[PDB]
Design a protein around this ligand. Structure first.
Ligand SMILES: COc1ccc(S(=O)(=O)N(CC(C)C)C[C@@H](O)[C@H](Cc2ccccc2)NC(=O)[C@@H]2CN(c3ccc(C(C)=O)cc3)C(=O)O2)cc1
Lengths: 99, 99
Protein backbone atom coordinates (compact mmCIF):
# COMPACT_ATOMS: atom_id res chain seq x y z
CA UNK A 1 0.00 0.00 0.00
CA UNK A 2 0.86 3.70 -0.22
CA UNK A 3 0.25 5.77 2.91
CA UNK A 4 0.06 9.56 2.56
CA UNK A 5 1.05 11.74 5.47
CA UNK A 6 -1.87 14.17 5.63
CA UNK A 7 -2.70 12.39 8.88
CA UNK A 8 -0.65 10.30 11.27
CA UNK A 9 0.43 6.98 9.65
CA UNK A 10 -1.44 4.79 12.13
CA UNK A 11 -1.97 1.13 11.30
CA UNK A 12 -3.21 -1.94 13.11
CA UNK A 13 -0.59 -4.21 14.64
CA UNK A 14 -0.92 -7.53 16.44
CA UNK A 15 1.23 -8.60 19.33
CA UNK A 16 -0.05 -11.73 21.07
CA UNK A 17 -3.82 -11.31 21.19
CA UNK A 18 -3.62 -7.57 21.55
CA UNK A 19 -4.51 -5.53 18.52
CA UNK A 20 -3.19 -1.99 18.82
CA UNK A 21 -2.89 1.08 16.62
CA UNK A 22 0.72 2.13 15.97
CA UNK A 23 2.65 4.76 14.03
CA UNK A 24 4.81 3.73 11.10
CA UNK A 25 7.71 5.90 12.21
CA UNK A 26 10.78 6.50 10.05
CA UNK A 27 12.17 8.75 12.82
CA UNK A 28 12.32 5.87 15.33
CA UNK A 29 15.38 3.58 15.33
CA UNK A 30 13.57 1.06 17.51
CA UNK A 31 10.00 -0.09 18.09
CA UNK A 32 8.39 1.26 21.27
CA UNK A 33 5.10 -0.12 22.58
CA UNK A 34 2.78 1.07 25.31
CA UNK A 35 3.02 -0.72 28.65
CA UNK A 36 2.01 -4.39 28.38
CA UNK A 37 2.95 -7.43 30.43
CA UNK A 38 4.75 -9.57 27.83
CA UNK A 39 6.19 -12.96 28.78
CA UNK A 40 9.90 -13.69 28.49
CA UNK A 41 13.30 -12.28 29.30
CA UNK A 42 14.05 -8.57 28.96
CA UNK A 43 16.76 -5.98 29.70
CA UNK A 44 16.31 -2.41 30.95
CA UNK A 45 17.02 0.46 28.58
CA UNK A 46 16.62 4.23 28.37
CA UNK A 47 15.49 5.94 25.17
CA UNK A 48 15.35 9.63 24.47
CA UNK A 49 13.37 12.05 22.39
CA UNK A 50 11.65 15.40 22.64
CA UNK A 51 11.23 16.14 26.36
CA UNK A 52 13.91 13.70 27.54
CA UNK A 53 14.19 10.00 28.31
CA UNK A 54 11.87 7.20 29.34
CA UNK A 55 12.71 3.83 30.87
CA UNK A 56 11.71 0.81 28.77
CA UNK A 57 12.02 -2.99 28.81
CA UNK A 58 13.76 -4.56 25.82
CA UNK A 59 12.24 -7.85 24.62
CA UNK A 60 13.96 -9.72 21.78
CA UNK A 61 12.60 -11.88 18.98
CA UNK A 62 8.96 -10.94 19.54
CA UNK A 63 6.63 -11.78 16.64
CA UNK A 64 4.44 -8.87 15.58
CA UNK A 65 2.06 -8.52 12.63
CA UNK A 66 1.83 -5.08 11.01
CA UNK A 67 -0.97 -4.50 8.45
CA UNK A 68 -1.07 -8.26 7.79
CA UNK A 69 2.71 -8.45 7.29
CA UNK A 70 4.75 -10.72 9.54
CA UNK A 71 7.68 -9.35 11.50
CA UNK A 72 9.86 -10.53 14.37
CA UNK A 73 12.34 -8.51 16.35
CA UNK A 74 13.14 -6.36 19.32
CA UNK A 75 10.32 -4.39 20.93
CA UNK A 76 10.79 -1.81 23.68
CA UNK A 77 7.98 -1.66 26.24
CA UNK A 78 7.37 1.33 28.47
CA UNK A 79 5.31 4.45 29.22
CA UNK A 80 5.19 5.82 25.68
CA UNK A 81 2.04 7.81 24.83
CA UNK A 82 1.85 6.13 21.41
CA UNK A 83 2.79 2.76 19.93
CA UNK A 84 5.74 3.31 17.57
CA UNK A 85 6.85 0.94 14.80
CA UNK A 86 10.50 1.80 14.22
CA UNK A 87 12.97 1.05 11.44
CA UNK A 88 13.95 -2.33 12.90
CA UNK A 89 10.51 -3.66 11.84
CA UNK A 90 9.66 -1.24 9.00
CA UNK A 91 12.47 -2.82 6.97
CA UNK A 92 11.02 -6.29 7.65
CA UNK A 93 7.66 -5.41 6.07
CA UNK A 94 9.32 -3.71 3.07
CA UNK A 95 8.54 -0.09 3.99
CA UNK A 96 10.18 2.78 2.09
CA UNK A 97 9.89 6.57 1.92
CA UNK A 98 9.21 7.92 -1.54
CA UNK A 99 9.04 11.41 -3.05
CA UNK B 1 14.08 9.30 -4.50
CA UNK B 2 13.15 5.99 -2.87
CA UNK B 3 14.67 5.80 0.63
CA UNK B 4 15.02 2.46 2.42
CA UNK B 5 15.14 2.26 6.20
CA UNK B 6 18.14 0.09 7.16
CA UNK B 7 19.82 3.42 7.99
CA UNK B 8 18.35 6.63 9.42
CA UNK B 9 16.64 8.64 6.64
CA UNK B 10 18.93 11.66 7.07
CA UNK B 11 18.97 14.23 4.27
CA UNK B 12 20.55 17.60 3.64
CA UNK B 13 18.25 20.59 3.93
CA UNK B 14 18.82 24.23 2.96
CA UNK B 15 17.30 26.84 5.27
CA UNK B 16 18.25 30.53 5.50
CA UNK B 17 21.18 29.80 3.17
CA UNK B 18 22.63 27.20 5.53
CA UNK B 19 22.93 23.45 4.94
CA UNK B 20 21.90 21.09 7.75
CA UNK B 21 21.23 17.38 8.09
CA UNK B 22 17.70 16.45 9.17
CA UNK B 23 15.76 13.28 9.83
CA UNK B 24 12.72 12.47 7.71
CA UNK B 25 10.32 11.64 10.53
CA UNK B 26 6.87 10.27 9.67
CA UNK B 27 6.06 9.93 13.39
CA UNK B 28 6.41 13.70 13.87
CA UNK B 29 3.42 16.01 13.25
CA UNK B 30 5.71 19.04 13.22
CA UNK B 31 9.12 19.99 11.89
CA UNK B 32 11.50 20.79 14.76
CA UNK B 33 15.06 22.04 14.31
CA UNK B 34 17.83 22.39 16.89
CA UNK B 35 18.70 25.86 18.22
CA UNK B 36 19.43 28.23 15.36
CA UNK B 37 18.77 31.81 14.30
CA UNK B 38 15.96 32.55 11.85
CA UNK B 39 14.76 36.00 10.81
CA UNK B 40 11.33 37.53 11.41
CA UNK B 41 8.55 37.22 13.95
CA UNK B 42 8.17 34.13 16.12
CA UNK B 43 5.73 32.94 18.77
CA UNK B 44 6.48 30.96 21.93
CA UNK B 45 4.94 27.50 21.84
CA UNK B 46 5.12 24.23 23.73
CA UNK B 47 5.20 20.80 22.12
CA UNK B 48 5.15 17.23 23.40
CA UNK B 49 7.38 14.26 22.74
CA UNK B 50 8.14 10.80 24.06
CA UNK B 51 9.81 12.17 27.23
CA UNK B 52 7.67 15.20 28.11
CA UNK B 53 7.17 18.75 26.84
CA UNK B 54 9.56 21.43 25.63
CA UNK B 55 9.46 25.11 24.81
CA UNK B 56 10.04 26.05 21.18
CA UNK B 57 9.96 29.14 18.96
CA UNK B 58 7.43 28.98 16.13
CA UNK B 59 8.42 30.53 12.81
CA UNK B 60 5.74 30.52 10.12
CA UNK B 61 6.02 30.39 6.34
CA UNK B 62 9.75 29.52 6.23
CA UNK B 63 11.23 28.13 2.98
CA UNK B 64 13.27 24.93 3.30
CA UNK B 65 14.68 22.86 0.47
CA UNK B 66 14.57 19.24 1.57
CA UNK B 67 16.68 16.86 -0.48
CA UNK B 68 16.14 19.14 -3.51
CA UNK B 69 12.38 19.58 -2.94
CA UNK B 70 10.95 22.95 -1.96
CA UNK B 71 8.72 23.50 1.06
CA UNK B 72 7.42 26.64 2.75
CA UNK B 73 5.90 26.23 6.18
CA UNK B 74 6.09 26.21 9.94
CA UNK B 75 9.44 25.50 11.58
CA UNK B 76 9.76 25.02 15.32
CA UNK B 77 13.14 25.73 16.89
CA UNK B 78 14.11 24.27 20.24
CA UNK B 79 15.75 21.41 22.20
CA UNK B 80 14.86 18.53 19.90
CA UNK B 81 17.47 15.72 20.08
CA UNK B 82 18.00 16.00 16.31
CA UNK B 83 16.68 18.10 13.42
CA UNK B 84 13.41 16.46 12.32
CA UNK B 85 11.28 17.02 9.26
CA UNK B 86 7.68 16.32 10.27
CA UNK B 87 4.50 15.68 8.31
CA UNK B 88 3.72 19.39 7.86
CA UNK B 89 6.64 19.54 5.37
CA UNK B 90 6.79 15.88 4.30
CA UNK B 91 3.33 16.37 2.74
CA UNK B 92 4.55 19.44 0.86
CA UNK B 93 7.40 17.52 -0.83
CA UNK B 94 5.07 14.64 -1.75
CA UNK B 95 6.47 12.06 0.67
CA UNK B 96 4.55 8.78 1.16
CA UNK B 97 5.24 5.53 2.94
CA UNK B 98 5.16 2.48 0.68
CA UNK B 99 5.32 -1.25 1.33
C1 LIG C 1 15.77 4.31 19.84
O1 LIG C 1 14.39 4.28 19.48
C2 LIG C 1 13.59 5.41 19.53
C3 LIG C 1 12.31 5.37 18.98
C4 LIG C 1 11.49 6.50 19.03
C5 LIG C 1 11.93 7.70 19.61
S1 LIG C 1 11.00 9.02 19.64
O2 LIG C 1 9.63 8.67 19.81
O3 LIG C 1 11.42 9.92 20.69
N1 LIG C 1 11.14 9.92 18.27
C6 LIG C 1 12.55 10.17 17.92
C7 LIG C 1 12.71 11.51 17.20
C8 LIG C 1 12.23 12.70 18.04
C9 LIG C 1 14.17 11.71 16.78
C10 LIG C 1 10.34 9.44 17.11
C11 LIG C 1 9.37 10.55 16.67
O4 LIG C 1 8.75 10.18 15.43
C12 LIG C 1 8.32 10.81 17.75
C13 LIG C 1 7.21 9.74 17.84
C14 LIG C 1 6.16 10.17 18.86
C15 LIG C 1 6.47 10.18 20.22
C16 LIG C 1 5.52 10.61 21.14
C17 LIG C 1 4.26 11.01 20.73
C18 LIG C 1 3.95 11.02 19.38
C19 LIG C 1 4.89 10.60 18.45
N2 LIG C 1 7.54 12.04 17.56
C20 LIG C 1 7.67 13.13 18.32
O5 LIG C 1 8.51 13.27 19.20
C21 LIG C 1 6.69 14.23 18.07
C22 LIG C 1 5.75 14.24 19.29
N3 LIG C 1 4.46 14.48 18.68
C23 LIG C 1 3.37 14.94 19.45
C24 LIG C 1 3.36 14.68 20.82
C25 LIG C 1 2.32 15.15 21.61
C26 LIG C 1 1.28 15.89 21.05
C27 LIG C 1 0.17 16.41 21.92
C28 LIG C 1 0.28 16.21 23.39
O6 LIG C 1 -0.79 17.00 21.42
C29 LIG C 1 1.30 16.17 19.69
C30 LIG C 1 2.34 15.71 18.89
C31 LIG C 1 4.47 14.32 17.37
O7 LIG C 1 3.55 14.41 16.58
O8 LIG C 1 5.82 14.04 16.95
C32 LIG C 1 13.21 7.72 20.16
C33 LIG C 1 14.03 6.60 20.13
Amino acid sequence: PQITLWKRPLVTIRIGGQLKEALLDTGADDTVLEEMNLPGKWKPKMIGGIGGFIKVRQYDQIPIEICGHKAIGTVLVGPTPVNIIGRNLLTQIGCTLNF
